[PDB]
Amino acid sequence: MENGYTYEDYKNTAEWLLSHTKHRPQVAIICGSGLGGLTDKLTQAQIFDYSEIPNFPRSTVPGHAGRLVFGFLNGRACVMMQGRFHMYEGYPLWKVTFPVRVFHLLGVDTLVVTNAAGGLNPKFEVGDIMLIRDHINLPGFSGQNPLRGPNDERFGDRFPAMSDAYDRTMRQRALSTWKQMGEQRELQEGTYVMVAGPSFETVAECRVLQKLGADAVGMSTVPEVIVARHCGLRVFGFSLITNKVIMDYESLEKANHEEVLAAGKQAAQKLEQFVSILMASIPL
Amino acid sequence: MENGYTYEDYKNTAEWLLSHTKHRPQVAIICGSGLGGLTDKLTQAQIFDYSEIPNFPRSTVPGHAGRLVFGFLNGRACVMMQGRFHMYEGYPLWKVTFPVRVFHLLGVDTLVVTNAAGGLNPKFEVGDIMLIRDHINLPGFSGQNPLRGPNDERFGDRFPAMSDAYDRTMRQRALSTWKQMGEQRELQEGTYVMVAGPSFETVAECRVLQKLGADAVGMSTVPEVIVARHCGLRVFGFSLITNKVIMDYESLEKANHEEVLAAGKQAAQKLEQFVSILMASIPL
Amino acid sequence: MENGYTYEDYKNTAEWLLSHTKHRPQVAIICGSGLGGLTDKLTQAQIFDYSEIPNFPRSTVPGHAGRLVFGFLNGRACVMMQGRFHMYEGYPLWKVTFPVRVFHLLGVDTLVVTNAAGGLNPKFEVGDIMLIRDHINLPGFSGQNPLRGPNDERFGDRFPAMSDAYDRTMRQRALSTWKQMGEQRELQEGTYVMVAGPSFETVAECRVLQKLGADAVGMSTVPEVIVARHCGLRVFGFSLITNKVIMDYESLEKANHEEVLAAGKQAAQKLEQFVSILMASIPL
Ligand SMILES: O=c1[nH]cnc2c([C@H]3N[C@@H](CO)[C@H](O)[C@@H]3O)c[nH]c12
Ligand SMILES: O=c1[nH]cnc2c([C@H]3N[C@@H](CO)[C@H](O)[C@@H]3O)c[nH]c12
Ligand SMILES: O=c1[nH]cnc2c([C@H]3N[C@@H](CO)[C@H](O)[C@@H]3O)c[nH]c12
């Protein structure tokens, strides 16, 4: 609606980093949060706190909005967001997604994003992993689109498509890796719907999200993919099911964050490895 | 997104009231509007205008945003909002719902909210009363959640559930009272969807709200339940059907406010009594 | 939510115009954009740039937000917006729709609005034209309604209906004209859904818009009809299908603006004539 950043601010944040860093990454990864441990498997790791990076979304205690790590993961030059920004935190989307536009100026050209999510598809099960074939951008329908505002042509068009958001190549490239390391549960595949804003859904709210044809649901991610494609990045992403969204009045259970962080933690290596391998089927 | 109130402002509003008032309420009721007359049945009633209560949502002519009454209803200590704030008035939700957070600081621990609403369910009929089993929080999906912003931990969690918003006990406790005073029309039971913002729905808009599985529709309420549960309040609520939402091109009729205020007025005692009795099956 | 304009600003913009203009229009037309050429067929045309009209939505380079033309089209006094304001441009709705409230103060009393749109209905085909029977105002459900804010009673009610937005008379008045000039493709008729904000829909997003029962989809229009009826204007409008919204993973095609402007251009006279004739079945 405004967008408080000019092209310059982006550039200036880039160049700064691009000069406290030997590194020049090609892929950006975004967790998770409980893909946290990933940071380990990197090597030659250089860390930064968001709080010291020019223009980053500042949170209240920094943070709470955490760290940017640069390094090598499976002999690929990475950079990853260990902790991210959300709309429910009160951040507008050109903030949430800000990081995303710096990455591209860094010359990263693939983005992988991950996240936890509730499962809407009855078939799914806590533990599973759903690749993201497509999304419903509900905040988007109503005005909340990280693209809203005057478009800067240096980044992209006024009117990008999202029909093809989630790289095809990568997605198979990908189920390979899944059995090509032999797993009991299959890879899932489906649609992430976004809703904002922090309260968990009602039962009726679930029924509606199932009707729309959604398979999983977070409050995340959605935004920063949309603006990845606005400027080229190939995009590949996926989701940890983490709870079966309560689907009927009767059940006495209740989503909590709690169970989410746990499951996230339980799932852990799974995962860390998965991404880690996948690195290898990203081009050059 | 911000939230202009700090914890202090809430507290200060409480304590003020908590000291021009003998009273110490346990239940908060919210009308209606045309449950207005309720104020009568209270006894030992002490009134206040929003306009003199520190921090209240100020409207333009005060008001237009009206009065807070404290008293006893059926030998329960109450406090009630005679007139409320809406999003379509231009108020953000941490304003609409502000009152709600003061109540809890007052030590109220049950909230009952009522409202008029259009009927989406063909079965329903003008006059009926729909208990609220659940809700679709449509403004919510897109970012408009009274909880959005940085969470204050003194009130509640970052990530409350709403699966169980509408107290089970109370809801039966409740159909009892309905025949246990013998009424021709049955109690209805169903889902309130919220949309904002003041224009009435189109026909196509109705068809969609019916598809989502909604039974009734207002522009209200939704918010302040969500933030009631964010901090404990037991929540019980319901709705006066007030018009059958025009469901097909052809009909020459048109929702108006008008018919709504009327029906509201027609329905009157019905009602006033109902709540009045219900008081008695709230704990202590 | 605020609305930065007072009644005065509207009036002042009117009177200004109402006095660099001989003219006194009765109908307002809004394109399109690629109904641009229409301006030709007017006669006795007086032009203005938005940029010089007191209070108009200013864009960045003026503009980019273009010109207001007054004249006679088929022996009717018109005034038309050659280029309009959108929400995705970052404009709030009491800006987008501002023009609309001036028109009425000008004493215009019919409004016709046109627009391009993607087709959701499989039956439709690029080239077709869909009259607007009704709309889904999705931004609206969540708070984005040009009416939101404190209502000024001089313009309209607090709670207008939209059940009957799209004049019945006019709509047939209308299919007449269509064969009454003998066309191969039939007139289409259906519902325009609005979403905001500039990115094109995903596939999953389409499936949902089809489910809701929408036939076409733009990011436009919706707003300014709603506020037309808030103050009397008879409203009649329609849509150029312009692309078949990609309805399945597989297809390698992608909406672009591009194809849209083209089709718009291809369609051209079609059209220019159509409106041109239609003028004649507007009253006096
Ligand atoms: O059942 C759900 N509904 C909505 N969001 C989530 C989420 C995501 N939302 C956040 C907590 O609600 C958490 O960070 C997670 O990534 C997990 N489960 C659900
Ligand atoms: O048919 C409807 N659609 C949307 N809202 C309402 C309402 C509620 N909305 C307000 C007026 O629209 C009124 O205060 C009422 O509580 C009644 N009927 C309808
Ligand atoms: O497939 C679509 N989806 C959403 N909007 C449009 C539109 C409208 N949106 C604008 C460009 O997206 C264009 O001005 C047009 O009037 C055309 N096609 C589509």
Task: Write up this protein.
Chains A, B, C: It is found in: Cytoplasm. Chains A, B, C: InterPro entries: Nucleoside_phosphorylase_d, Nucleoside_phosphorylase_sf, Pur_Nuc_Pase_Ino/Guo-sp, Purine_phosphorylase, Purine_phosphorylase-2_CS. Chains A, B, C: Pfam families: PNP_UDP_1. Chains A, B, C: One of its GO terms (molecular function) is identical protein binding. Three copies of one chain form a homotrimer. Chain A is α/β, with parallel strands linked by helices. The first copy, chain A, has helices at 7-17, 93-96, 98-105, 138-141, 168-172, 175-179, 203-211, 222-229, 257-265, 269-278; strands at 27-31, 43-49, 67-72, 77-82, 110-119, 129-136, 188-194, 216-218, 234-244. Chain A has a single domain (1-284), classed as Rossmann fold (3-Layer(aba) Sandwich), CATH 3.40.50.1580. Chain A has ten helices and nine strands. In chain A, α1 packs across α3 and α3 runs parallel beside α8 (222-229). The longest helix of chain A is centred in the first third of the chain and has 11 residues, at 7-17. The N and C termini of chain A lie far apart (36 Å). Chains in contact: A-B, A-C, B-C. The interface between A and C is medium-sized, with 35 and 35 residues. Bound molecules: 1,4-dideoxy-4-AZA-1-(S)-(9-deazahypoxanthin-9-yl)-D-ribitol (3 copies). One 1,4-dideoxy-4-AZA-1-(S)-(9-deazahypoxanthin-9-yl)-D-ribitol binds next to β5, β8, β9 and α9 of chain B. The site of one 1,4-dideoxy-4-AZA-1-(S)-(9-deazahypoxanthin-9-yl)-D-ribitol has 16 residues of chain A, from β5, β8, β9 and α9.
